[PDB]
Amino acid sequence: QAEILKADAEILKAYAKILEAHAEILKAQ
Amino acid sequence: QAEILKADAEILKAYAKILEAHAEILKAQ
Amino acid sequence: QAEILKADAEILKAYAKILEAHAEILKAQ
Amino acid sequence: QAEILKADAEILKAYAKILEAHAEILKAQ
Amino acid sequence: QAEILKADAEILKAYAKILEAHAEILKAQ
Amino acid sequence: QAEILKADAEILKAYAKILEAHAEILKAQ
Amino acid sequence: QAEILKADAEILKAYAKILEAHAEILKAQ
Amino acid sequence: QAEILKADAEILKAYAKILEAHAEILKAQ
Amino acid sequence: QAEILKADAEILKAYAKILEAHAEILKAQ
Amino acid sequence: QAEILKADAEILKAYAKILEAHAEILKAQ
Amino acid sequence: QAEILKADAEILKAYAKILEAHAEILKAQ
Amino acid sequence: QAEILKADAEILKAYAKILEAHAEILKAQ
Amino acid sequence: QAEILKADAEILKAYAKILEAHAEILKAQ
Amino acid sequence: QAEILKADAEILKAYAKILEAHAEILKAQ
Amino acid sequence: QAEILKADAEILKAYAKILEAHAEILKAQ
Amino acid sequence: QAEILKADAEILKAYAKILEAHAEILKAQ
Amino acid sequence: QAEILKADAEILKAYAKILEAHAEILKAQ
Amino acid sequence: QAEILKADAEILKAYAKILEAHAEILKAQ
Amino acid sequence: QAEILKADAEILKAYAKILEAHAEILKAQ
Amino acid sequence: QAEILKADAEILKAYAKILEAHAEILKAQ
Amino acid sequence: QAEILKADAEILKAYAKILEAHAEILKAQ
Amino acid sequence: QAEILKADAEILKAYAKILEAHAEILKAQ
Amino acid sequence: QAEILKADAEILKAYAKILEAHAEILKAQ
Amino acid sequence: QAEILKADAEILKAYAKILEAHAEILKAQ
Amino acid sequence: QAEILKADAEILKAYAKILEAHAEILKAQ
Amino acid sequence: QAEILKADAEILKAYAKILEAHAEILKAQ
Amino acid sequence: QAEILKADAEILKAYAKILEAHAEILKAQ
Amino acid sequence: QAEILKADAEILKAYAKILEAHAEILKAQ
Amino acid sequence: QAEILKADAEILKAYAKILEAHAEILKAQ
Amino acid sequence: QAEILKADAEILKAYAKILEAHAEILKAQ
Amino acid sequence: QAEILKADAEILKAYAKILEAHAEILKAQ
Amino acid sequence: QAEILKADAEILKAYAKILEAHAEILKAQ
Amino acid sequence: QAEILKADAEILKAYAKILEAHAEILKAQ
Amino acid sequence: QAEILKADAEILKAYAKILEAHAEILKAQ
Amino acid sequence: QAEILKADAEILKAYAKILEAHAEILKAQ
Amino acid sequence: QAEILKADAEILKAYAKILEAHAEILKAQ
Amino acid sequence: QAEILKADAEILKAYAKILEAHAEILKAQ
Amino acid sequence: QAEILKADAEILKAYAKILEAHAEILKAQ
Amino acid sequence: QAEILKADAEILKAYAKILEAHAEILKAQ
Amino acid sequence: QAEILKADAEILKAYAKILEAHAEILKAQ
Amino acid sequence: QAEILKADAEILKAYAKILEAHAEILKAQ
Amino acid sequence: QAEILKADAEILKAYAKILEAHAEILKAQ
Amino acid sequence: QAEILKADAEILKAYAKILEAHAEILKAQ
Amino acid sequence: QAEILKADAEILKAYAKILEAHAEILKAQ
Amino acid sequence: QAEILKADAEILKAYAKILEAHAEILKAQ
Amino acid sequence: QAEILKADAEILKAYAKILEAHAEILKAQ
Amino acid sequence: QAEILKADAEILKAYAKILEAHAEILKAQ
Amino acid sequence: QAEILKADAEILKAYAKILEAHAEILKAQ
Amino acid sequence: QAEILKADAEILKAYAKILEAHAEILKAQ
Amino acid sequence: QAEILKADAEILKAYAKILEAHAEILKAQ
Amino acid sequence: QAEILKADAEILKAYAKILEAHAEILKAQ
Amino acid sequence: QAEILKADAEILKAYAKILEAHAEILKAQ
Amino acid sequence: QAEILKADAEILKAYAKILEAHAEILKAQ
Amino acid sequence: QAEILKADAEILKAYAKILEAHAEILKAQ
Amino acid sequence: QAEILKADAEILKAYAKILEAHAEILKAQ
Amino acid sequence: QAEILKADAEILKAYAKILEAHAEILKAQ
Amino acid sequence: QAEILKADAEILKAYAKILEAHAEILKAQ
């Protein structure tokens, strides 16, 4: 099951990346 | 059943890949 | 019934393959 | 009835085959 | 009634055969 | 699981970044 | 976990910044 | 944790600032 | 923690200011 | 006993819906 | 007893729907 | 009793729908 | 009692629909 | 026992919904 | 035992909902 | 045992809801 | 053991609610 | 162990409620 | 240990309630 | 240790109740 | 130590009750 | 020491009860 | 007094329902 | 007083329903 | 007072329904 | 006294329900 | 006394429910 | 005395519930 | 004496519950 | 004496609860 | 004497609770 | 003597509580 | 003698409380 | 003799209280 | 002899009270 | 003095209860 | 003084209840 | 003072209830 | 002060209910 | 202050209800 | 502040309802 | 801020309803 | 009114006569 | 009224006659 | 009324006759 | 009334006969 | 009444026969 | 009554037989 | 009654057999 | 009764076997 | 009874085994 | 019984082992 | 019993070890 | 107030008159 | 206020008059 | 306010007048 | 506000006038 958990971890990491990228774009605006 | 679980794991991995790729594209924009 | 379950497993595996392939194409774009 | 179940299993197997073949074609594109 | 059930089983078997044959043709394309 | 926790941490960090950036924009207005 | 806590701290700091900025704007009005 | 506490302190300080500013406006009215 | 306490003190001071200002307005009416 | 035959008819109607959906696919192409 | 015959008619109508769907497929080609 | 005959007529109408669908197929070719 | 005769007429009309469908087939050829 | 066949029909209807959704996808393209 | 098959059908219906949502995405683009 | 499969279906339905929400986002843009 | 998978599905549903709320934000703009 | 994951989901749901409230704010403006 | 995470979620939910109340204020204006 | 965080959340919830009451005032006007 | 923070929260809740009562007054007018 | 703060909160709650009673009076008029 | 007549009308309506049911029987034959 | 006449009309309408049901019988024959 | 006349009209309409039902009978013969 | 007549009407309505159920039986055959 | 007749009607309604259930059986066959 | 008849009706209703349950069984098959 | 009949009805209702549970079993299969 | 029959009914109801629990088990599988 | 039968019913109810708990276990898995 | 059987039922209920607690454990995992 | 069995049941209930507490621990983690 | 078993149960209940307190500790952390 | 075991249980209960007090301390912090 | 009028109202309410009970009687007949 | 008027209103409400009960009687007839 | 007017309104509402009951009577006739 | 006006509105609403009841009477005639 | 205006609107709505009831009267005539 | 305007709109809507009721009167004549 | 404009629109819509009601009056004449 | 009742009695008598005559005819068949 | 009751008695007698005659016919079949 | 009761008795007797006749027919099958 | 009771007895006897006959048929299968 | 009891006895005997016959069939499977 | 008891005994015997047969089947699996 | 007791004994014996068989299967896993 | 006791003994023995088997499995993990 | 006691002994032995095994696992962690 | 006592001894020994192992882990931290 | 005592001794020894280890950690802080 | 009391007296006198008149009528019956 | 009381007195007097008049009419019947 | 009270008095006087006039009319009938 | 009150007084006076005038007309009839 741990594989599922680490998959979730990578999911959330990517989500955070999307968030901070949108943040950088907002900062550029 | 464990085969189903690892299938799900690979599913979510691919989903995370899609997410981070869309994130990289957003970053390029 | 287990045959049905492993059939489902292969289904989901193929679905994940489709997903990651679409992801690679998105990455190429 | 089990015959019906294994018929379903073969159905789903063939469906998965169609899926992964379409996936390979998508990959070729 | 069981005769009806096994008839259905053969039906679904033939359907699966049609499916996998169409799949092989798709693979050839 | 700790990976999930640190993912959450990065999430919240990014959220705080969004917040303070919106704050800086409000300050500019 | 402490990382989560300091993330929260930064969150609340940003919130306070938003608050005092809104306060400065109210003062300007 | 003390960081959280001082964050709270700054929060409440900003709140007091909002309060006294609203008070000054009320006084002007 | 004392910072929190003095924050509270300033809070209550501002509240008293609001009160006496409302009182002065009532007196003007 | 008739309800058994009702279930059989349900089986067959399901199969019919399968074929109808297959036609829907093919028409969609 | 008649409801038994109703179920029989339901069987037959299901079969008819099967054939109709098959025609739908063929027409769609 | 008449409802029994109604069920019989339903049987026959189902058969008629079968033949009609067969004609639909053949016409579609 | 007449409703019995109505059911009889329904029988006959069903048979007529059968023959009509047969004609439809033959015409379709 | 019939409820077992009801479950079988449910299986098949699910498969039909799968195919229908696949058609929906393809039509959407 | 049938409830097991009900669960299987639930699996398949879930997969169908997945595909339907994917179509919804693609249509939305 | 079937309840295990119910949980699996719940997993998949959750994933479907994820994709549906993603579509909701994209449509909202 | 299944309840573990229930918790996993809860994780995923939470993530879905996150995305849905994000869409709600974006739509609100 | 699953209850740990329940707590994780609670974390995420809390974050979702945060975002939802943020949307509520923005909509209110 | 999980109860610690429960407390964290409580922190976050409190923050969410803060934002919700802020929205309530703004809506009230 | 978690109870400390519970107390922190209590602090924040108190602050939220403050803001909510402020909104209640403003709405009452 | 946490009980100290509990007392702080009690302070704040008291202040909130003050404001709520003030709103009660104003509403009563 | 915290009990001192408890007494302070008691002071404030008393004041709140005063204001609440004043509102009760005014409402009673 | 009128309610007495209402009861009389109820009597008559009951009798009418009797006759209607008798007709239902006869029609059913 | 008029409600008395309403009851009378109810009597008559009941009688009418009687006759109508009698006609229903006779028609059914 | 007019409602009295409404009741009278109701009487007459009831009588009309009586005659209409009588006609229904006679027609049915 | 009228309630006595209400009970009589209840008797008759019960008898009507009897006849209606008898018709239901006969129709079911 | 009327309540006696109510009980009689209850008897009859029970008998009607008996017949209705018998019809339910027969229909179920 | 009427309550005796109520008990009789209860007897009969119980018997009706018996038959209804028997129908439930048969339908379930 | 009637309470004796009530007990009899209780006996019968118990038997009915038995049959109902048996149906529940069979349906569950 | 009736209470004896009440005890008998209790016996039977217990047996019914047994069967119901058995069904609960089987359904749970 | 009846209380003896009450004890017997208690025995049986205990056994039922045993089976119910067993089902609870199995469901929990 | 019956109290002996009561004690037996107590034994069994204790065993049931054991199993229930075991289920509680397993669910908790 | 029965009291001996009561003591036995007490033993078992104690064991059950042990297991319940163990579950409480595990849940607490 | 039974009181000996009561003492044994007391031993076990004490042990259970030990474990419960241990859980209380762990939860408190 | 049993009283010896009672004393043992007293020992254990004392130890439990120790642990409970330790938890009380830790909770108090 | 008002309490005298309260007693008067009690008198009247008693009389009303008398009439209501009389109606209860008459309805019961 | 107002409570006197409350008593007066109680008088009147009692009278109203009287009339209402009288209506209840008359309706019951 | 307002409560006096509340009592007046209570007087009037009582009178209204009187008239309403009078209407109830008249309607009942 | 506003509550005084609320009482006035209550007066007027009472008067309105009076007139409405008067209309109810007149309509009832 | 706005609640004062709410009370005014309540006054006016009451007056409107008065006029509406007057119309109800006149229409009823 | 907006709620003040809401109250104003409520005033106006009340006036509109007044005029509408006046029209209702006039139409009723 | 937008909600302020919503209130303005509410004002205007109220005025529109006023004019519409005036038209209703005039049309009614 | 009693005249109406005896009219009803004669009605039902005639109905019973019709019933038993139809019964005699059924017996002759 | 007793005339109505005996009319009902004769009704039910005739109904029983119909029932037993239908029973004799069923027996002949 | 006893006439009604004996009518019911004959009703139920005839019903039992129908039941046992249907039983004899089932036995012949 | 005893006639009703013995009627019920014969009813239940016939029911038991039906049951054991169905049992013999099941045994033959 | 004893006749009813022995009827119940025969009922339960037949039920047991059905049970053991179903058991023998299960054993044959 | 003893007949009822021995009927119950045979019931439970058959139930035990079903149980041990299901056990033997489980053992064969 | 002893027959009931030995029936219970056989019940519990069979239950123990089921338990140990499930145990042997668990051991095989 | 001793048979019941030894049945319980075998029950608990089997339970202990299940426990130690689960223990061996835990040890293998 | 001693058999029950030794059963309990084996129970507790197995429990201790589970405990020490969990302890060894904790030690390995 | 001594077997129970030594079982308890082994229980407590294992508990002490768990304790000292947790202690060693705490020491490592 | 002495085994129990030495078990307790080892318990308390381990407890003292936990205490002094916590003490060493406190000393390190 | 005494006027109210004598009014009540006359009320009750009239009520008694109604009662004795109804009594005389009952006596005439 | 006394004017209100005497008004009530006259009210009740008139009510008594109505009562005794209705009584005289009942006496005439 | 007294003006309102005397208005009420005149209201009730007029109501009493209406009552006694209706009473005189009833007396004339 | 007193102006509003006296307006209400005049309102109620006029209402009483209407009432007594309607009363005089009723008296003339």
Nearest to AG8 among AF11, AF13, AF29 (CB): AF11
Chains contacting AZ (3 or more CB pairs within 8 Å)? AH, AY, BA
Three-state DSSP class for residue AG18: helix
Count, residues in chain AY: 29
Contact state of AA3 with Z8 under an 8 Å Cβ cutoff: no
Q: How far apart are CA B15 and CA B13, in angstroms?
A: 5
- Do AN26 and AO25 meet the contact criterion of CB atoms below 8 Å apart? yes
- Which of Q4, Y6, BA10 is CA-nearest to residue AZ14? BA10
Three-state DSSP class for residue AE12: helix
Q: How far apart are CA R26 and CA R18, in angstroms?
A: 13
W3 touches chain Z (CB under 8 A): yes
Q: How far apart are CA G16 and CA BB22, in angstroms?
A: 85
Contact state of AS1 with AA11 under an 8 Å Cβ cutoff: no
Alpha carbon distances (Å) from G5 to A14, I12, AK26 = 21, 29, 76
Three-state DSSP class for residue D1: coil
Q: How far apart are CA AP1 and CA S27, in angstroms?
A: 8
Q: How far apart are CA Z11 and CA D26, in angstroms?
A: 75
Number of AK/AL CB contacts below 8 angstroms equals 49
- Which of S10, AP29, AN11, R25 is CA-nearest to residue T19? R25
BD7 touches chain BC (CB under 8 A): no
Encode AQ14-25 in three state secondary structure.
Answer: HHHHHHHHHHHH
**D3's tokens:** 């015959």
Q: How far apart are CA AR14 and CA AR20, in angstroms?
A: 10
What DSSP assignment string belongs to BA1-29?
Answer: -HHHHHHHHHHHHHHHHHHHHHHHHHHH-
Q: How far apart are CA AO29 and CA AN23, in angstroms?
A: 9
- Closest approach of J1 to chain AA, Cα-based (Å): 5
Q: How far apart are CA AB4 and CA AS4, in angstroms?
A: 15
Q: How far apart are CA AI14 and CA AI5, in angstroms?
A: 14
Q: How far apart are CA S11 and CA R7, in angstroms?
A: 13
Instruction: For CA atoms AD2, AD4, AD8, AD11, give the dihedral sign.
Output: positive
Q: How far apart are CA BD23 and CA BB18, in angstroms?
A: 16
Q: How far apart are CA AA16 and CA Z11, in angstroms?
A: 12
Q: Resolution (in Å) of the shown entry?
A: 4.2
Task: Please classify residue M26 by burial: count the beta carbons closer than 10 Å to its beta carbon, then call 0-12 exposed, 13-18 middle and 19+ buried.
Answer: exposed
Three-state DSSP class for residue U29: coil
Q: How far apart are CA AB7 and CA K7, in angstroms?
A: 41
- Which of AZ14, BA1, AG20, AF16 is CA-nearest to residue AH8? BA1
With tokens 């001192």, the residue in question is V4
Q: How far apart are CA AI4 and CA N15, in angstroms?
A: 70
Contact state of AS23 with AT25 under an 8 Å Cβ cutoff: no
J2 touches chain E (CB under 8 A): no
Contacts of AK29 in chain Z (CB under 8 A): 1-2
Q: How far apart are CA U9 and CA U26, in angstroms?
A: 26
> What is the per-residue burial (b if ≥16 Cβ within 10 Å, else e) of O14-29?
bbbbbbbbbbbbbeee
AW21 touches chain AX (CB under 8 A): no
AN24 touches chain AM (CB under 8 A): yes
M24 touches chain W (CB under 8 A): no
Amino acid symbol at V12:
L
Q: How far apart are CA BC5 and CA AZ18, in angstroms?
A: 87
- Do AN6 and AO5 meet the contact criterion of CB atoms below 8 Å apart? no
Nearest to D8 among N4, N11, N18 (CB): N11
Three-state DSSP class for residue AB1: coil
Q: How far apart are CA Z23 and CA AA8, in angstroms?
A: 22
Q: How far apart are CA U16 and CA T28, in angstroms?
A: 16
L29 touches chain W (CB under 8 A): no
Kindly state the DSSP code that residue AL1 receives in the 8-state scheme. Answer: -
Task: Please classify residue B2 by burial: count the beta carbons closer than 10 Å to its beta carbon, then call 0-12 exposed, 13-18 middle and 19+ buried.
Answer: exposed
Q: How far apart are CA AO8 and CA K20, in angstroms?
A: 66
Instruction: For CA atoms X3, X5, X8, X12, give the dihedral sign.
Output: negative
Q: How far apart are CA L4 and CA Z19, in angstroms?
A: 21
Beta-carbon contacts of AH20 under 8 Å, excluding residues fewer than 6 positions away, are AG21, AG24, AG25, AI16
Q: How far apart are CA AT13 and CA AT3, in angstroms?
A: 15
Chains contacting T (3 or more CB pairs within 8 Å)? H, S, U, AH, AI, AN, AO
Q: How far apart are CA AF9 and CA AD3, in angstroms?
A: 21
G14 touches chain H (CB under 8 A): no
Contacts of AQ8 in chain W (CB under 8 A): 11-12, 15
- Do K17 and J13 meet the contact criterion of CB atoms below 8 Å apart? yes
Secondary element (H or E) of residue W1: none
- Do I22 and U29 meet the contact criterion of CB atoms below 8 Å apart? no
| Side-chain-facing half-sphere of W11: CA atoms under 13 Å | 27
- Do AG29 and R4 meet the contact criterion of CB atoms below 8 Å apart? yes
CA I8 to chain centre: 11
B19 touches chain C (CB under 8 A): no
Residues U24, U25, U27: CA angle, nearest 5 degrees: 65
**AQ10's tokens:** 């004669």
W24 touches chain AK (CB under 8 A): no
With tokens 């077992």, the residue in question is N4
Nearest to B8 among P4, P11, P18 (CB): P11
Secondary element (H or E) of residue AZ24: helix AZ2-28
- Closest approach of P7 to chain AD, Cα-based (Å): 13
Q: How far apart are CA Q13 and CA AU4, in angstroms?
A: 59
Alpha carbon distances (Å) from AX22 to T3, AE23, AQ7 = 36, 18, 84
Q: How far apart are CA Z22 and CA U5, in angstroms?
A: 77
- Which of W2, N12, AH2 is CA-nearest to residue J10? N12
Method used for this model? cryo-EM
Q: How far apart are CA W10 and CA W5, in angstroms?
A: 8
Q: How far apart are CA B16 and CA B9, in angstroms?
A: 11
| Side-chain-facing half-sphere of E10: CA atoms under 13 Å | 5
AZ28 touches chain AY (CB under 8 A): no
SS3 content of chain G, % helix, strand, coil (to 5): 95, 0, 5
Beta-carbon contacts of A12 under 8 Å, excluding residues fewer than 6 positions away, are F4, F7, F8, F11, Q15
- Closest approach of AW24 to chain AE, Cα-based (Å): 17
Contact state of BC7 with BD9 under an 8 Å Cβ cutoff: yes
Task: Please classify residue BE21 by burial: count the beta carbons closer than 10 Å to its beta carbon, then call 0-12 exposed, 13-18 middle and 19+ buried.
Answer: exposed
| Side-chain-facing half-sphere of I8: CA atoms under 13 Å | 21
Chains contacting AM (3 or more CB pairs within 8 Å)? U, V, X, Y, AL, AN, BE
Q: How far apart are CA N26 and CA J26, in angstroms?
A: 10
| Side-chain-facing half-sphere of S25: CA atoms under 13 Å | 14
Task: Please classify residue K4 by burial: count the beta carbons closer than 10 Å to its beta carbon, then call 0-12 exposed, 13-18 middle and 19+ buried.
Answer: middle
- Do S12 and T8 meet the contact criterion of CB atoms below 8 Å apart? no
Instruction: For CA atoms AW3, AW6, AW12, AW15, give the dihedral sign.
Output: negative
Cβ-based neighbour number of residue BB24 at 10 Å:
12
- Do AA12 and Z11 meet the contact criterion of CB atoms below 8 Å apart? yes
Instruction: For CA atoms F5, F7, F10, F11, give the dihedral sign.
Output: negative
Contacts of AJ5 in chain AK (CB under 8 A): 4, 7-8, 10-11
> What is the per-residue burial (b if ≥16 Cβ within 10 Å, else e) of AQ1-29?
eeeeeeebbebbbebbeebbeebeeeeee
Encode B1-29 in three state secondary structure.
Answer: CHHHHHHHHHHHHHHHHHHHHHHHHHHHC
Three-state DSSP class for residue U21: helix
Beta-carbon contacts of BA8 under 8 Å, excluding residues fewer than 6 positions away, are AI11, AI12, AI15, AZ12
The dihedral formed by the CA atoms of U12, U16, U19 and U23, expressed in degrees to the nearest 10: 180
H19 touches chain T (CB under 8 A): no
Q: How far apart are CA AX4 and CA AW12, in angstroms?
A: 8
Contacts of AV12 in chain AD (CB under 8 A): 15
Beta-carbon contacts of C28 under 8 Å, excluding residues fewer than 6 positions away, are none
Amino acid symbol at D21:
A
What Rg value do the Cα atoms of chain AY yield, rounded? Answer: 13
R28 touches chain AP (CB under 8 A): yes
What DSSP assignment string belongs to AC6-29?
Answer: HHHHHHHHHHHHHHHHHHHHHHH-
The dihedral formed by the CA atoms of AQ1, AQ2, AQ5 and AQ11, expressed in degrees to the nearest 10: -110
Contacts of AC29 in chain O (CB under 8 A): 1-3
Cβ-based neighbour number of residue F25 at 10 Å:
13
Number of L/Z CB contacts below 8 angstroms equals 4
CA W28 to chain centre: 19
With tokens 């019989």, the residue in question is L8
- Which of O7, C4, N4 is CA-nearest to residue P2? O7
